[PDB]
């Protein structure tokens, strides 16, 4: 595989929105256990299985995808935020 | 009936999760018609017969119930969202 | 990952102990609100933040852990029983 | 100039160590801006001016050098990783 470029509009650690929504690009380092959102055990929760992850957003790759709660941005498929909600598959 | 107080955690219209899920407290003013989700004729679709409705959520009353897609929140039994799926059993 | 699948010794709904101790593997469906045990808001209480949860137990996973009040069995990190107690440390 | 021979042991995108280090062989496609590591503006950071680049590594050339954090591998002088540190001297 070729290296996966990091989008200029990916949510960053230094963004007020990320701080507000407790988003972390790496779910393993997130507060998912402390949040204890309902749906899946906490350590299985990440953007890849969240209701708001948008696979068809401008600039999306299999590593970077959109989120309906972060307009005009891109989150990491391995991330997590406190709005994590199991996708109604 | 008596004037029933609206729960402090009822899903509000200007909540980003609500906007993304296309939830309307009133099914009769919702996108159920245009969406024509499978299961039942659109005019019959509301949270009361949705699979994700949680009748025994904390604080639920005969008018406000929980929803798997709105952790910690309460929705109206006569509401609807783009996630509506006919309840089985 | 795989679907929710309780290991061999997961406390079961028709286990006399479970019934006696008011345990439910899903805290959002338990009597935590009615019981209103002291320490934290009832809706914030679950096995993961209970003093009796034991991280080091046979067959334990990120989702299933031991509980000192259920010797030899496993409970869900998202569960709750009427013995929920503050996590001292 | 003649074509720059690539090494078979170049760090590759699907190497767990590369992923963990946030390495990208093309720094302009990396997370350096988001990382905002100290010493130089993000846009000026690459392996060529990193403290850990190892010029005297087996098979190292004009374009590929070693890195203390990647034993037995070679990085691209134009690359970058989240361990970038301005070289002193
Ligand atoms: S809302 Fe879902 S998709 Fe968006 S950042 Fe949070 S966990 Fe990821
Ligand atoms: S998912 Fe079902 S219960 Fe929840 S808001 Fe939508 S229609 Fe109502
Ligand atoms: S005592 Fe604590 S760990 Fe054990 S079942 Fe009850 S709430 Fe869970
Ligand atoms: S540590 Fe320095 S030399 Fe090694 S990959 Fe990172 S930036 Fe390049």
From Swiss-Prot, chains A, B, C, D:
Q: List, in alphabetical order, the GO biological process terms annotated in this UniProt record.
A: aerobic electron transport chain
For whether the record's keyword set contains S-adenosyl-L-methionine, the answer is: no
Q: Where does [4Fe-4S] cluster bind?
A: 47, 50, 67, 81
The record's subcellular location field reads: Periplasm
Keywords in alphabetical order: 4Fe-4S, Electron transport, Iron, Iron-sulfur, Metal-binding, Periplasm, Signal, Transport
Q: Which GO terms describe its cellular component?
A: periplasmic space
Q: List the disulfide bonds.
A: none
Q: Record keywords: S-adenosyl-L-methionine included?
A: no
Molecular functions (GO terms): 4 iron, 4 sulfur cluster binding; electron transfer activity; metal ion binding
- What superkingdom heads the lineage? Bacteria
| Job of this protein | Specific class of high-redox-potential 4Fe-4S ferredoxins. Functions in anaerobic electron transport in most purple and in some other photosynthetic bacteria and in at least one genus (Paracoccus) of halophilic, denitrifying bacteria.
- The name of this protein is High-potential iron-sulfur protein
Species this protein is from: Allochromatium vinosum (strain ATCC 17899 / DSM 180 / NBRC 103801 / NCIMB 10441 / D)
Q: What is the gene called?
A: hip
Placed within the complete protein, the shown segment runs 38 to 122 of 122
């Amino acid at each position: 595989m070729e290296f996966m470029s990091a989008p200029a509009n990916a949510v960053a650690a230094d963004d007020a929105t990320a701080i507000a929504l407790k988003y972390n690009q790496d779910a393993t380092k997130s507060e998912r256990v402390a949040a204890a959102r309902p749906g899946l055990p906490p350590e299985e929760q990440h953007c890849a299985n969240c209701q708001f992850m948008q696979a068809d957003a401008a600039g999306a790759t299999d590593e970077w995808k959109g989120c309906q709660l972060f307009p005009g941005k891109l989150i990491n498929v391995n991330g997590w935020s406190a709005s994590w909600t199991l996708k109604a598959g």
